[PDB]
Design a protein around this ligand. Structure first.
Ligand code: MTN
Length: 164
């Protein structure tokens, strides 16, 4: 297991524009195109992301290219963020993956708002952090995925993604 395999499980792979859990047009492995309710807009965003006039359909290689960019972007977003970087630096590589997962899903600003959880993670109070992480819109709206990420922070293992 690693952050790519982890997010491929949590995000899936779809080659045609689809709406994500929040109703927003997305493609590939969780690549958000736009919050606009316009499908033509989503397609315009898609075409400029991949560099060609798509029909709203991409290949697996193109999906993977966007996904690599998006994972890289989440990591660099963590390392540029004054609240997230010290927590990231303090973690082991498995828990680091859990933090990248969260930023991938909700963005740097949303994760940086989890001030209590981030303090408990930095303190390595893992069970307390797991309890606080669940007290969130995040958990309530995507509870199975949040449980997997939370189990990763609690245990520092990949047990929630084993067999998946
Ligand atoms: S992506 C922005 C956009 C796309 C399109 C559907 C052509 N639009 O009318 C606006 C400019 C909203």
């Amino acid at each position: 297991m690693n952050i790519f395999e982890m997010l491929r499980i949590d995000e899936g792979l779809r080659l045609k524009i689809y709406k994500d859990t929040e109703g927003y047009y997305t493609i590939g492995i969780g690549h958000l195109l736009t919050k606009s309710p316009s499908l033509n807009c989503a397609k315009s965003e898609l075409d400029k992301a991949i560099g060609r006039n798509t029909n709203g359909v991409i290949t697996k290689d193109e999906a993977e290219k966007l996904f690599n960019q998006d994972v890289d972007a989440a990591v660099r977003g963590i390392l540029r963020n004054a609240k997230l970087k010290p927590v990231y630096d303090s973690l082991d590589a498995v828990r680091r993956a859990a933090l990248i997962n969260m930023v991938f899903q909700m963005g740097e600003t949303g994760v940086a708002g989890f001030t209590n959880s981030l303090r408990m993670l930095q303190q390595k109070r893992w069970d307390e952090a797991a309890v606080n992480l669940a007290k969130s819109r995040w958990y309530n709206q995507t509870p199975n995925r949040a449980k997997r990420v939370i189990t990763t922070f609690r245990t520092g293992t990949w047990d929630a993604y084993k067999n998946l």
